Amino acid sequence: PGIVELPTLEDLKVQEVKVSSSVLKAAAHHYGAQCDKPNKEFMLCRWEEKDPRRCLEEGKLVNQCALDFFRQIKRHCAEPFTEYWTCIDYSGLQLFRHCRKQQAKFDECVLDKL
Amino acid sequence: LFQAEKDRRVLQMLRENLEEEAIIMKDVPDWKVGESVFHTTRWVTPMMGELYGLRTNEEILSATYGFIWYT
Amino acid sequence: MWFEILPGIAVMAACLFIPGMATAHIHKFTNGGKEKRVAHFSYQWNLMERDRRISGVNRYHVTKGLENID
Amino acid sequence: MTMYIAFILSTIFVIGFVGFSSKPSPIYGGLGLIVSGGVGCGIVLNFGGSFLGLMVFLIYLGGMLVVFGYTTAMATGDWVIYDTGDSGFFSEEAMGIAALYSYGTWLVIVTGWSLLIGVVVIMEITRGN
Amino acid sequence: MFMINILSLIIPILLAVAFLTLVERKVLGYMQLRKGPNVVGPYGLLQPIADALKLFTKEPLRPATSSISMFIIAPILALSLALTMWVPLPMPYPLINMNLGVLFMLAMSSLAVYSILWSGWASNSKYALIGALRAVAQTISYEVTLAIILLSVLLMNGSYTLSTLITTQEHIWMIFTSWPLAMMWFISTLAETNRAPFDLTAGPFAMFFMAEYANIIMMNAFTAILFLGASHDPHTPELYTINFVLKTLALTITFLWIRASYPRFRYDQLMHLLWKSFLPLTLALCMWHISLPIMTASIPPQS
Amino acid sequence: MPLVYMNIIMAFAIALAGLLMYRSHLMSSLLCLEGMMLSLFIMSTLIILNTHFTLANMMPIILLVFAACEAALGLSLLVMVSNTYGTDYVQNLNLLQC
Amino acid sequence: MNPIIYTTLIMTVMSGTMLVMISSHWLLIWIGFEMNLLAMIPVLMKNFNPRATEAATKYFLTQATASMMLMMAIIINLLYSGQWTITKMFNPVAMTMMTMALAMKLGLSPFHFWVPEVTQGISLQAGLLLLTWQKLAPLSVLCQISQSINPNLMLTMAMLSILIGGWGGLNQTQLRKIMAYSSIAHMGWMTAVLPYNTTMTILNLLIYITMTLAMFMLLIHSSATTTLSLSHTWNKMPVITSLMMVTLLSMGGLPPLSGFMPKWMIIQEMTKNESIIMPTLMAMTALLNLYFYMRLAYSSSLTMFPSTNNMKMKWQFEHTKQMKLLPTMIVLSTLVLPMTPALSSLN
Amino acid sequence: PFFDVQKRLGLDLDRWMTIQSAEQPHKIPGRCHAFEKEWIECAHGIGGIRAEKECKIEFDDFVECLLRQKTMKRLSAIKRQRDKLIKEGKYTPPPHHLGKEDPRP
Amino acid sequence: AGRIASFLKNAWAKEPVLVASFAIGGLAIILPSLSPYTNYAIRINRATPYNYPVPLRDDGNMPDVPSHPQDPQGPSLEWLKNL
Amino acid sequence: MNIMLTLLTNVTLASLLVLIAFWLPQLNAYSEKRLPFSMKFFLVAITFLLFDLEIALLLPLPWASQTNNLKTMLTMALFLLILLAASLAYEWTQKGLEW
Numbered sequence A: 001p002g003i004v005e006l007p008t009l010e011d012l013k014v015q016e017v018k019v020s021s022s023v024l025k026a027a028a029h030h031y032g033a034q035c036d037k038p039n040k041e042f043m044l045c046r047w048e049e050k051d052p053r054r055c056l057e058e059g060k061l062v063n064q065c066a067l068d069f070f071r072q073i074k075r076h077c078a079e080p081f082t083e084y085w086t087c088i089d090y091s092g093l094q095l096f097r098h099c100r101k102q103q104a105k106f107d108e109c110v111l112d113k114l
Numbered sequence B: 001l002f003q004a005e006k007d008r009r010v011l012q013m014l015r016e017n018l019e020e021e022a023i024i025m026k027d028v029p030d031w032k033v034g035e036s037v038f039h040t041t042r043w044v045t046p047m048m049g050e051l052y053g054l055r056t057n058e059e060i061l062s063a064t065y066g067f068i069w070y071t
Numbered sequence C: 001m002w003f004e005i006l007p008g009i010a011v012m013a014a015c016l017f018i019p020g021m022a023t024a025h026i027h028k029f030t031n032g033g034k035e036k037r038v039a040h041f042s043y044q045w046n047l048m049e050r051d052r053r054i055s056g057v058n059r060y061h062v063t064k065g066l067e068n069i070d
Numbered sequence D: 001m002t003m004y005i006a007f008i009l010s011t012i013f014v015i016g017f018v019g020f021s022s023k024p025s026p027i028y029g030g031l032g033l034i035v036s037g038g039v040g041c042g043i044v045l046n047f048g049g050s051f052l053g054l055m056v057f058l059i060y061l062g063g064m065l066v067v068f069g070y071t072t073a074m075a076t077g078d079w080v081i082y083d084t085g086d087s088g089f090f091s092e093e094a095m096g097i098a099a100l101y102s103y104g105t106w107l108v109i110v111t112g113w114s115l116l117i118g119v120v121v122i123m124e125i126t127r128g129n
Numbered sequence E: 001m002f003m004i005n006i007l008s009l010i011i012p013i014l015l016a017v018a019f020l021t022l023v024e025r026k027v028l029g030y031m032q033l034r035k036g037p038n039v040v041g042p043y044g045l046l047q048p049i050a051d052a053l054k055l056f057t058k059e060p061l062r063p064a065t066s067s068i069s070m071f072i073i074a075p076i077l078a079l080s081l082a083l084t085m086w087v088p089l090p091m092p093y094p095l096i097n098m099n100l101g102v103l104f105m106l107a108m109s110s111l112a113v114y115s116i117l118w119s120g121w122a123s124n125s126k127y128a129l130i131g132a133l134r135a136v137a138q139t140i141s142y143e144v145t146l147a148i149i150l151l152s153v154l155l156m157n158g159s160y161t162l163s164t165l166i167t168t169q170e171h172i173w174m175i176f177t178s179w180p181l182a183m184m185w186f187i188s189t190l191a192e193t194n195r196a197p198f199d200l201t202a203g204p205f206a207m208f209f210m211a212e213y214a215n216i217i218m219m220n221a222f223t224a225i226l227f228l229g230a231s232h233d234p235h236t237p238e239l240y241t242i243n244f245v246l247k248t249l250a251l252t253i254t255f256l257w258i259r260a261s262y263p264r265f266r267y268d269q270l271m272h273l274l275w276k277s278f279l280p281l282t283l284a285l286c287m288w289h290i291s292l293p294i295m296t297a298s299i300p301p302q303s
Numbered sequence F: 001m002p003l004v005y006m007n008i009i010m011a012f013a014i015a016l017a018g019l020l021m022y023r024s025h026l027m028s029s030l031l032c033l034e035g036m037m038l039s040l041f042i043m044s045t046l047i048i049l050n051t052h053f054t055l056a057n058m059m060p061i062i063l064l065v066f067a068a069c070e071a072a073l074g075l076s077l078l079v080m081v082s083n084t085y086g087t088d089y090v091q092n093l094n095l096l097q098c
Numbered sequence G: 001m002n003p004i005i006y007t008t009l010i011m012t013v014m015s016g017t018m019l020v021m022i023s024s025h026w027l028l029i030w031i032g033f034e035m036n037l038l039a040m041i042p043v044l045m046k047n048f049n050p051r052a053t054e055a056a057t058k059y060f061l062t063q064a065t066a067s068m069m070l071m072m073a074i075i076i077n078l079l080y081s082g083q084w085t086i087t088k089m090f091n092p093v094a095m096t097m098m099t100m101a102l103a104m105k106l107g108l109s110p111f112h113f114w115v116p117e118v119t120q121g122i123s124l125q126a127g128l129l130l131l132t133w134q135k136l137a138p139l140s141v142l143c144q145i146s147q148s149i150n151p152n153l154m155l156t157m158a159m160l161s162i163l164i165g166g167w168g169g170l171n172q173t174q175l176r177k178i179m180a181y182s183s184i185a186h187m188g189w190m191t192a193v194l195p196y197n198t199t200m201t202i203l204n205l206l207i208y209i210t211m212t213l214a215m216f217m218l219l220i221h222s223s224a225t226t227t228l229s230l231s232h233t234w235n236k237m238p239v240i241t242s243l244m245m246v247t248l249l250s251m252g253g254l255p256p257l258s259g260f261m262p263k264w265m266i267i268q269e270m271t272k273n274e275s276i277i278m279p280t281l282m283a284m285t286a287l288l289n290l291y292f293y294m295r296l297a298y299s300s301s302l303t304m305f306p307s308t309n310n311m312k313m314k315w316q317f318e319h320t321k322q323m324k325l326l327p328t329m330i331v332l333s334t335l336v337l338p339m340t341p342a343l344s345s346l347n
Numbered sequence H: 001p002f003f004d005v006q007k008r009l010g011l012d013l014d015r016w017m018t019i020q021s022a023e024q025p026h027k028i029p030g031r032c033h034a035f036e037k038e039w040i041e042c043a044h045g046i047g048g049i050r051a052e053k054e055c056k057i058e059f060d061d062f063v064e065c066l067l068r069q070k071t072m073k074r075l076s077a078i079k080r081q082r083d084k085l086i087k088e089g090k091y092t093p094p095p096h097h098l099g100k101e102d103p104r105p
Numbered sequence I: 001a002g003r004i005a006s007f008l009k010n011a012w013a014k015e016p017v018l019v020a021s022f023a024i025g026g027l028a029i030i031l032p033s034l035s036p037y038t039n040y041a042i043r044i045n046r047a048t049p050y051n052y053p054v055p056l057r058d059d060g061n062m063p064d065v066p067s068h069p070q071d072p073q074g075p076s077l078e079w080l081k082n083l
Numbered sequence J: 001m002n003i004m005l006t007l008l009t010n011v012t013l014a015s016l017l018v019l020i021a022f023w024l025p026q027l028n029a030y031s032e033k034r035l036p037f038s039m040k041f042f043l044v045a046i047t048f049l050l051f052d053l054e055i056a057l058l059l060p061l062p063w064a065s066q067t068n069n070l071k072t073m074l075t076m077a078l079f080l081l082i083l084l085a086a087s088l089a090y091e092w093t094q095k096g097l098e099w
């Protein structure tokens, strides 16, 4: 009874974020603080529409905004962030507790630059 | 970000399954390609078999049993 | 004297040294020189799956850094 | 697909039940019962219910069938029904079972009273006279 | 490279339980103003090899009238459980990581009595059957207290994961948090493995002996991990491995010491000891450890 | 309805038939009863976990507890039967008759 | 046993029955059944003897099988519809198994074999309790799902129960077996009106409970278990024999006694649904119950059987402990026909 | 029979466990939360007979969500037809269904 | 008073295990109702985010709901940090 | 999969070593020449079973500590332990633990 409608593959094409989980976790707090508005718009649309097919544009926006955030990180604070995410990636649990020193270095660097 | 990527991946898998269904079902007389089994038109979360039905057995086993078997 | 008990005990120490370290070394050799990723609660399992799909070599421990952001 | 491993385990479960359903030499029927319980625990663990499977494997096998054997010695298709999403940062089964103390007050009360009454009943029956 | 890990976990345990007999003989000898085996090899080091070869070259005394099935099954189950209970433990990284490791260990310990029951039933003698019944009753009675104490201690840990026990005891040993539970757990481990003062009792005989000694060492490592936590540095697990092995060896020496230092209980005396001294204190301390985190707002994190 | 539930129901039916046969050895009757209970536990666990009905995860454990209590009760009765007759044979319970 | 322990066990039995009656969840109902079974066993074994132990083990086996069937049917119903509330069953297969479980609990034929032996083995007080109170829970459960029961199965099992009770009551000499067969026939009458009107079921339950309470209280007062022991009663307490004969006539359905109230009313209800053959068959079958009640009355009061010399001593002593509610039970079981329309109270 | 003590006293002894969509811990949703909710709202205060006759669509959807029998039938038919064509040789799987695709996060 | 003290002294001899068990059990039963940190434990349990906080739709009449996480509006966990 | 392989390896090694231990001394030829039923054992077995059931009830305590209903959870846990202690006391007072 009825026909399901699915968007074409051209509607699902977007520049993916090609960083690993540890890299995402290293900058998770700053990403949440800076990228908050598109994230909240997308998630509110998600629990309001209750349909993945009605929230493609907000997903594209959140991908673009995350890419902009990571481009800023790459432009300004590449090396401290590299050390921080390497340290986070080494641990099996990916604990923030292990190397607070690198986290402090990255935080002070990004506070000085951006 | 994870939610957006999940939605996009699910939609792409469903679209590929729909394309393959359209290709295969061309000769069955009474078949309606992409026909829902629910009377309502509301979005329904697909099963594991609805996504990995036509894929290789290896990734089917992965998607169904990896978390349980990972120790 | 009493220290003659020490040799045999030492052997047990060696017999108890072998398993633990061995696992650790294996856990490194198979996982690219890093700690093995543990998967509880079904959320970090999705993280390893995303890492495996991102890496392009079908191995989660291959970490794609910021250089892949273009 | 591991040749329908759930189906294989279910078939072995049925074979074990047939094995001790003939009731031959009750100790051998008991052994078949441990075999079937192990297969059932394997099924539950494979499905995803680790805690419930461990409850089976601990309580049933270790205590109850052990008491059964003690008393005897004293005398003479799949994988498609599964989910799509994730459970979050916790296991849903553990949360549901642990909700016994915050939600199931009535269940706890009735089960505790039933267990105490069972103790009293066992003492009264085994008193003899 | 997983089979290599399993073999490197299994074979060293067998070697350790082989040399534990030599170590026990030497310790009890020197505690008795004498020397242990010191003629065979440099310092008795070749004694376990001679013992094993002699046992494996001696004919088995099969009753030829009992059930061969359970007679051969029981050592298989005993040795399998003894070797299997090793995997859940984390030294520092566990071979197999299981969320509910402790419950798995408890289930294995509960299943351990089937070997005793089946061996006693297949011995085809009323006296052996009575002995097996007594052993089974003692083991189940003491594993009750084992389980209660184990859950009471884990209440301060957060979950049943064995690895988290390293994180919980990062700043202080769990021995200081609850020593009475530790002592009662120690006595319960003594009585569960049929060691003095609770030891009221060729091929398969050596099978059972190795299973018992492997159970001793496994219970020892479990106690050391649970109550005597060592510092773990992720960049050098060798320190944690060395500390864990040293603590396990110290505990094993303590069991040999206790065996050499005491007379033995009667059956009724140990049954009364448990049911009238350990279980009341066990319940009281379980209530106390339920109430303590709520009182002090120190509930462990993981859930 | 998949084949797993069919197999579990078939196992329950086989256990019920074994209970109702009564060759001898009432201990085997208790064993068949508790085999039915184990089949019930497995089926209920699978059904509850499949639908993610979280609050129903209490149901199997409780079930098991109660059932095990019943088993204990039954065992006690069996013991006295043996103590009255020396053996647990079913045919010894022919004193009461219609 | 200790009076405190006996009182606690009685409390637990009543609490389990009440939990079954007042719960809207299937699991809680099963828990109530389990509690009832667990606490009922020592009551049967208060007077320890091999007969009591054998009756208790038969009862335990039957009740455990019934409870397992009930739980398995609940599992099927949950499978085919994720609902725990006690309402329409939603499954044809689940309904059939639940009906057999509740019939095993009640004692309806062909699951009736355990009732006579369990009643014979246990004492008179335990028999009274088993035949009066143990039936409230399964009957309440059946009344809650009366809209789902298949009329064919329920009606044929009711017919079989009435026939079996009527036929088996003729041969028995011991009073407890007669009472067990009477209970079987009465529940066969009772469950036949479940698909049509549950109010008639509850009214029949109340009337039957009153009559059987009066009957076991009279049998306890004059400590008689076999027919001849009851025949010896007239020499000491003729009033007891006369009241017992009146109660026996009431239980047979003779108007204008109270026992005529249910059958008549039940027949009326089954006539409203154009069911004519079955009420006639039920009346003609209950004639057999009447026959063996009349034989018991002939043996008890309407004739004077030979006595024994020692009975003279029993003339000198009075019944020390006196049971209350016996006159009320007799009156309610004999002279309440003019108050029939009170059944509209949905009792 | 059914003495509704709970509704008289408002105790809520065992009503929280009756349905899937009633206050799950941590707000964990049932697999068929939407269908059960829709059916319950359809059949509330209507009576058993009328709910059975009128809300049959919602109950059918709920049963389909619970057991997915029609989905199994459709998937099995598709798989059998694909097997028949690949046996006769008029169908070839795309790289996506051969593991040669490009996975995405 | 005197009889209770005498009975306690008698029980402390020849039966110390039961006295210790009852003392610990009663103390563990009584104490939580008096400790002031149980409310802190409840608050700590309440402050642990297990689920994603779904944002609310703005209608211009929500002054207590912050528009950004950095905004002063909303609950604060400074008390937990000070602990 | 890993745990299945580990269990299979354990059982296989145990079986192989037991069979070789049983068959090594069999290659060389040689000469090749009730009622009591004590009730106390059954009573202690039943007590163990029932206490095991109550321990199974008590098991989910580690996860029960995070519910935000700390008062209700604490009351229920203390209730369960109090019933366990009361069962032990009842079995004690009427000589259920005598040999």
Ligand SMILES: CCCCCCCCCCCCCCCCC[C@@H](O)O[C@H](CO[C@H](O)CCCCCCCCCCCCCCC)COP(=O)(O)OCC[N+](C)(C)C
Pocket (backbone or CB within 6 Å): D102, D103, D105, D106, D109, D113, H011, H013, H023, J069, J071, J072, J075, J079
């Ligand atoms: C009311 C009639 C009293 C006299 C008659 C008693 C009849 C038999 C006794 C059994 C009935 C007792 C009633 C208990 C029902 C439990 C529900 C009620 O009490 O509310 C609970 C309140 O909890 C209370 O702490 C219950 C404590 C009562 C248990 C202690 C003693 C029980 C003894 C009963 C007899 C058992 C054997 C004898 C023991 C001495 C729920 O707490 P709440 O947090 O709002 O809700 C949680 C759900 N959320 C998550 C949605 C919010």
Ligand SMILES: CCCCCCCCCCCCCCCCC[C@@H](O)O[C@H](CO[C@H](O)CCCCCCCCCCCCCCC)COP(=O)(O)OCC[N+](C)(C)C
Pocket (backbone or CB within 6 Å): G203, G206, G207, G210, G332, G333, G336, G339, G340, G341, G342, G343, G345, G346, G347, H001, H002, H003, H004
């Ligand atoms: C011999 C005939 C039977 C006599 C039975 C003994 C008589 C003494 C009983 C004392 C009073 C009985 C009940 C106590 C009153 C308070 C309880 C009251 O609240 O209950 C109400 C109900 O009241 C009782 O049901 C009525 C009791 C009256 C019984 C007498 C009727 C007998 C008719 C034929 C004989 C005529 C009487 C002869 C003298 C007694 C609530 O009803 P409700 O919860 O909403 O519906 C539940 C039933 N459902 C589920 C089917 C819908």
Ligand SMILES: CCCCCCCC/C=C\CCCCCCCC(=O)O[C@H](COC(=O)CCCCCCC/C=C/CCCCCCCC)COP(=O)(O)OCCN
Pocket (backbone or CB within 6 Å): E180, E182, E183, E184, E186, E187, E197, E223, E227, E258, E262, E273, E277, E278, E281, I014, I015, I017, I020, I024
């Ligand atoms: C503000 C509130 C504070 C919180 C309250 C907490 C305070 C608690 C204070 C008391 C707790 C102490 C409990 C210790 C355990 C009690 C067990 C016990 O008392 O049993 C003994 C019995 O114990 C034994 O005898 C066991 C002997 C077994 C041999 C072991 C030898 C002991 C030496 C080994 C060293 C122990 C190792 C401990 C460390 C282990 C590290 C892992 C008494 O038995 P009976 O003499 O027969 O008396 C009963 C008849 N009237």
Ligand SMILES: CCCCCCCC/C=C\CCCCCCCC(=O)O[C@H](COC(=O)CCCCCCC/C=C/CCCCCCCC)COP(=O)(O)OCCN
Pocket (backbone or CB within 6 Å): E276, E279, E280, E281, E283, E284, I008, I011, I015, I018, I019, I021, I022, I023, I024, I025, I026, J082, J085, J086, J088, J089, J090, J092, J093
């Ligand atoms: C309300 C708290 C409940 C929770 C805490 C307790 C939980 C677990 C502890 C209790 C377990 C069950 C106890 C069973 C009681 C059995 C009593 C008994 O019968 O024993 C008597 C003996 O016991 C007694 O003397 C009676 C009770 C003894 C003392 C009981 C408690 C006394 C007061 C406790 C509190 C102390 C005051 C508080 C001080 C606070 C600090 C200043 C018989 O001795 P036998 O061992 O059988 O004989 C062997 C030798 N022929």
